[PDB]
């Protein structure tokens, strides 16, 4: 018994192996192939559409999960067969997929440059001359325009539906301030520790892997944008049966709680905090903490996953050929 | 407790070193191995080294690059009376800058539902439309498919180094209009495979072999294979050197190397692990490096396509396609 | 009869190194010395050695480019067993590709009109606007031009490398509003000198000294300029391999050597030009490697320059200026 | 003392120049002869006498500059009874601004290794791809291609002007898809037929020539060869004008220009030179503006170019290119 | 500076700094399609003193033009079509030349402009190289800066004298004087020009970047 699971490889593949992968195959008895891909979204279409696909189980950001499955490219699953996933808040899941793993998009900061009072918000972000510094931001829309919204004053709280016609007003703006528009977490990552920015958005995952190895930076959740992948199963998978069963450990509340202690990635799983795994110093620095999600804004994937979302897109090839 | 940051291609190969080498040598070393994935490392190995702070200290990457990055002193200069490990090794395993870690091979493969009984099995075969009927996919890009065209226009797998470039694109273009697809990801070349997409192509032996074992009725020969390897460096002015240095030793160990193929259907970079005992006979008998599957494939030269001569060649590509 | 095709940047330097070196040498040793010009040859030589059949044999070309040409296999690895007028140089002269041919700076050079006394003697003193009022030049390039901005900010000559890129950059900002032209050829910087449309510049010592000869009221200072060199080198594959090796001997001979000088304002690359008493005690102290003078001066490290940060600093240099 | 600066296109050609009349013309007048070199001479010649004190005194430049300088009052008008040998010269080789100092062609060369007979010989063979397969290579430039087309579409070389651009751009777009490179230099445009990267092209016959004495076995055929030239002219604002008006008289000396085809295979721009006898039956055969040679080429009308056509013809080329 | 005394009967804006601070100053906006005095406006409004501007830091001028940009309606590139914008209302605020602006005024757009921090340009006469009528031209030259011919000129359109001496023929009354842009109170109000530095090699390549600058 076997199936193919594929993420995003890297650091946050590695952890999911140790974490869940690993454990779920052996108490499954099961066999749990791996491929990997920064953008999971063009493939599923081709392989989906074939009608013999040869992925089963993608993790991917949610959003794409919602359009998959509104497409019918992607299984409605069954709950009663995942208890797990059944036991998990209706807002950690769709009719489509359940949610894996929290990952925030927040602003971070050199603390050579800002050894103290450090940006703090994107309206911090925007004000060249209160907080003079080289800038990067992501060359995606992704967060990138509910950033520049709340530079505009918007509460975290109420950017959705998203006006559109704002954000890239506000990215104008800044667009002479911005050092360079990143492409990976890799080249985010590395543009803190050479400092050739003072100040960016960036996955925390990467800008705490990055102060882990030696660099002096930091970041806030303050105005995070708190994102998620989720699970879901390709419509034709070679093996939907095991994909099922596996999809139920994979969200296993101990399975779910050993991904922080090697990523710094919160669990799908709210039940993970409650299996005493994480250390209290370590459940607090996870994007998906009560405490830290609390100043962040939760990315609506209804939103992004409509064809809102994806006129959104196609404005930003305009943006950036600009 | 110190550190490096390992990166590779990510996926079923990367997870397959993590159990056969990485967890290993970090639990031998008493390190923590930090992993990061890239479909081409070079673009940011140039920025990482050029800005003086890497963020990478290992890289595991086509052996071709590891020349070519050695000589614009991108990658540091091996002491290998610090890798004895790698000193034993013989001296066509190893460059000034690198140290061989895995063969793998391009290969004919082929649906065993279209070749029940007669498949295709040389490049010869392979350009023979008439003959041998069906829809083909090759990669696109010149390295192996240069050598393949070579070797079907009669051109024996040990002697077509230096390449006849001109007579290479000749043949390819003769054989275009067959050509389905031209595919730029291995996945991509599974799915092919898989879905019946295509008949017959050229593709990783990897790939083949996995959604072989998938399912798929698919399989290859490796007559007149292309047999390359990766290898592993270091990357000029790496954050931890010392630490990297000897993680170089423990990774090319006759034992850690002989379980790779234990994992994943490719060869080991140190042949001595063919002596460790760990290996059975029917396995060794189907990875690429085995003494009498080589025999049957072309030893790609990376002195070649690392020479002005393989850049040129690479340069022409562009222009081919299109 | 033997013959070998030798490139340079013409000019009134090409007709120098003809009737101190190329006629004399190929008189001695019988050969035809066919000559060709380029203004930057390596773009060309990565061509010809790409085809397998250059129609250049020897090159004099900066420094720098040699060390990385020699790396990538795109020049000869010298046997200067059979070059023994090279070997006899001090081993900073010549590189395992290449030899030291000749001496050349970029210099501080102003207007004796605008400057009856106290002229400006030095970087600070170019980018002191208040003190030295006029207009200015600098080289729309990156090499020298970066060293004289870190000297601007008072790094002393024999401290420079590695250059501090960044700091490099934030002072040519600041003189950035004031440099009324960014010459991109000799000839236009000498133009710009002798018309007065500028009052200082950066420029080529020999292209000031020409123009001066003409009869134009301007003059420089070696105090504070960068010493650079252009060596030769022979391309991998020279059609004349043996015929090239042996004019390279008569190249660096001590006197052809030193008769260059004697009909342009460049210094010889081999020192012991100096000890031959061809050229005149008045004469030696305007050369740019004659020991007093050069001992104003920064040695340009092409070490540093061909090495990956320099690449990066020259990447740099497209975003700057614009 | 007196002193002239001197400026052509360097190569192989100025070196030529030196040899045959510079030094013999210094030392008969007993001047300094400064030389300087440029691609092309024309903007640098619109800013230097704009500026009222250019460095240049003596330009040597394709005959077109001359006249359309001389017509926008950039040129000396010469007083032709100051100088003998060019007033002796037949009207047709000189201007009021100008006296003609050599004559080169643009020829269809060909590779005598793809053509050991029967060998391309006319624009109409060239554009015929079916009758003569091969690669082919024109310059990336309007100057004797646009000719050359319109002799392809069946004109007379003698009944080109003015010239049918609209009818030269058909038949170059026709020719388009069929043409390897676009050469952008001399030196790119002999290793491309050295290297049999084209096996025939557009060149200029000094080129040709030089590559095929190398041991390329290479030829051209003059028939329907584009026969050009280049001039003398000094311009207005000369710092040298006396001077540079009795260098002049020399520089076009029977004898000293018909030393020039000694060193290299360009015509005497001063027709004198022929009855000399120092240019031998067998050389003579080879240059372009012997006349039998001459009656087999199409003769460039510099009026057409100099004029308000050729700058337009100018301006659409670059929009042709695509 | 112009603007509508409809958007702005009180408070209007009054300086570069103002034209930028789209949040205190609302409304639709214009600027002149080319560098000349755009930059200079720029760099005002990034705090640099009218007597301070030159040479142009060129880069920090166009760095806050894109800064701008977005809030921009349109980029004129007539004099009337200038003058159009405002008298249609399609921009509440725009730089313009000031003679367009106080043509549509008295035509009776409810439109204004102030002086502070105004660009202070000029026109001069110059004779052609080969001029086929010279001597006639030079004696030409004469009268057209003769002080009366000059002080006339303001009686017929809102341009200041290029002859100083006109202010002293009593030509030009008080409160006609009070218009002009180069009389000294609106003169000290504004940046001088500095024609050194537009016609040397920098203001060529200012100009040369302006067409990249557009998208």
Redesign the interface.
Do not use: L, R
């Given at each position: 018994a076997?199936i193919?699971f594929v993420s995003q490889?890297?650091?946050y593949?590695?952890a999911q192996?140790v974490a869940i992968l690993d454990p779920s195959a052996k108490k499954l008895g099961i066999t749990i192939?791996?491929?990997?891909?920064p953008d999971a979204w063009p493939?599923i279409k081709?392989?989906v559409g074939?009608?013999?696909?040869?992925w089963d189980v993608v993790d991917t950001p949610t959003g794409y999960c919602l359009r998959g499955g509104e497409q019918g490219l992607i299984e409605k699953l069954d709950f009663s067969k995942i208890p797990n996933a059944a036991a998990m808040p209706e807002a950690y899941r769709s009719p489509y997929s359940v949610s894996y793993e929290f990952y925030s998009s927040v602003l971070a900061y050199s603390q050579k440059t800002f050894p103290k009072d450090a940006p703090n918000s994107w309206v911090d972000f925007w004000d060249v001359k209160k907080f003079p510094g080289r800038r990067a931001l992501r060359n995606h829309p992704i967060a990138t325009l509910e950033a520049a919204l709340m530079a505009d004053g918007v509460a975290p709280d109420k950017l959705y539906p998203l006006d559109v016609d704002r954000a890239?007003?506000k990215l104008?703006?800044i667009?002479?301030?911005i050092t360079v528009w990143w492409t990976?977490g890799?080249?985010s990552?590395?543009l803190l520790?050479?400092?050739?920015v003072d100040m960016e958005m960036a996955w925390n995952g990467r800008v705490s892997?990055?102060a882990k190895?030696?660099a002096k930076v930091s970041f806030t959740y303050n105005q995070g944008i708190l994102q998620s992948t989720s699970l879901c199963i390709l419509k034709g998978a070679?093996n939907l049966e095991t994909a099922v069963k596996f999809l139920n450990e994979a969200v296993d509340p101990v399975h779910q709680a050993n991904l922080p202690l090697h990523i710094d990635y919160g669990p799908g799983n709210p039940k993970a905090f409650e299996t005493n795994v994480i250390k209290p110093e370590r459940a607090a620095q996870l994007p998906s903490e009560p405490a830290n999600a609390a100043k962040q804004a939760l990315m609506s994937y209804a939103w992004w996953s409509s064809p809102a979302g994806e006129a959104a897109e196609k404005r930003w090839a305009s943006f950036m050929q600009?």
């Open positions: 076997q193919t490889g890297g650091a593949q590695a192996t192939n791996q491929d990997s891909i493939a081709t392989q074939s009608g013999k696909p040869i890239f007003k104008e703006e667009k002479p301030h990976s890799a080249q990552a590395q520790n050479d400092g050739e892997a990055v190895e030696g070679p600009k």
